[PDB]
Amino acid sequence: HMPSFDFDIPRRSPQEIAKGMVAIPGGTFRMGGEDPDAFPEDGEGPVRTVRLSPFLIDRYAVSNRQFAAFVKATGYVTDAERYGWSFVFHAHVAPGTPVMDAVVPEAPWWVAVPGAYWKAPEGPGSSITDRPNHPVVHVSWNDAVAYATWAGKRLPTEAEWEMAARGGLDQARYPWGNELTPRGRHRCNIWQGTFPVHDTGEDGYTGTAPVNAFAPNGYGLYNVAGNVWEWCADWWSADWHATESPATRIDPRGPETGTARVTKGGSFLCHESYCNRYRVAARTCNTPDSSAAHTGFRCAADP
């Protein structure tokens, strides 16, 4: 990918770039999943051994405070601002807010809201005054790449994301193990209740949570499962990675062309009765200029 920017890339030292990041040593891991209930269209399989070069990855998804500093320093205008609207979950749109009649096929819980963007995540009249340490949302893949490049970083590949999110466990279902709520404790921010009608908020949150909520995984990463979907560098496909080759098994970057970019980790809206996509092997995609109230990103870096 060859992005275009209207801001210069500032000079930063290795120590500055590495703050808030954990060093993932080079090595192998078992990527993918073989859950029998996985949607074939998602291409969670096959399980395969992948070798990665050492990399750094953010402990936290990028926060509102951090994104605001980027915008302040560069004047960056996000895709949602250019388009003039972004996707908001229906229950979070205040009554009377102007809304488009737009319909996401099969997902009527999404509302296209004029004026919804990272600083007004539910549309005009909303703000982030009480969410400085929440993940930034309404950021597209383009916006994420712009932030990351300004920060001296990049997006993780899907393999890098998954190795870091798995946190040193071999083929566990979640970042922390195989049980969703071990010892009865919530470990991530997803939906509880009856989707899309009523979120009980049992885990403490019916929207985004702070980026440092819940315990980290074994590598010190927070909210890799749940909270917000996280953009990765790769173009999406369901089957490129089924080939056995160096390109798909050593520092894999995904297919060279595509239409949507990979997103990982699930969000505060995910639920077993509908998508069951907060398992660490799960995966989906979105087109790169799209944005939504449940999607953000974390950065990676080459040491």
Partner: peptide, 14 residues
């Protein structure tokens, strides 16, 4: 009925 959707795209509403 069809694959659950978690990623709503701008293209999808046209």
């Amino acid at each position: 009925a069809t694959t659950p959707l978690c990623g709503p795209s701008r293209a999808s509403i046209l």
